[PDB]
């Protein structure tokens, strides 16, 4: 399924980073969070939004992943100082490439060239694509978020928040199914060059992480967006401003592990003896044995209890 405060929530672990959000997928509920709204430069994480515009372009049928795109000199790292040092798909002017293979270059390689080529194809140009990136931050209520460039390079004005990126990540996971799946592909070969997905957590042999993206912000630490499944439930950990690359891996998997062991996401409501609503909730596992629920329409209300404390309330029907 996809949709204030968690009752009797155990104490959060201490988190060594600037900012953090651990969020539930089904509900969007924050399980824990520190300094989550502080404006911080996202660096390459801007590319989550870039992929999202591509996803939404496919979803509205304006493009298709089979569409054959021609690479302008725009999307070629030779002669563009904007690109040197940065990560690339290594496209050449005159290359004819699928939307799909450009989406893989974006995601798996974090290809800055690929962003430009997708941008020109999708909006007709770089600045119109950023207009769309800002329109989709505004639709999604990313109140701390503003973009300037299609790849996050040469963009000192751009900014986001741990919270906003949690929200954007949930929208990404909830979009086109085969788009999100490309975040889990471990490698891409393009024009004779093979490169590795930079998200180390994908190879973790203790979870099912199909996560998003890692990054770094000149003089503001190390950042991460992971997401993990366990059975029928998904968590999203954003970490920002960790000391070191090893920190953000350990802090992100410390968050997700504490999420996984101590909480569950459950179906409270459905169709029966008590609603018209289906309703899902994030609860501590220790709280599951303590939850109690005390013409066409009707006139009472349902009052959900955890132990002897009411938490939420909805009308009573039939």
Numbering used by the authors: -14 to -12, 2 to 272, 290 to 309, 323 to 346
Paper's wording?
PBP6b (also known as DacD) is another putative DD-CPase in E. coli, with 47% sequence identity to both PBP5 and PBP6a. PBP5, PBP6a, and PBP6b are periplasmic proteins binding to the cytoplasmic membrane by a C-terminal amphiphilic α-helix, which is important for the physiological function of PBP5 (33). Adjacent to the membrane anchor, there is an elongated, β-sheet-rich domain, which appears to position the globular, catalytic domain at a fixed distance from the membrane. Taken together, our data indicate that PBP6b is a DD-CPase specialized for growth at acidic pH and that the redundancy of DD-CPases ensures that sufficient activity is available under various pH conditions.
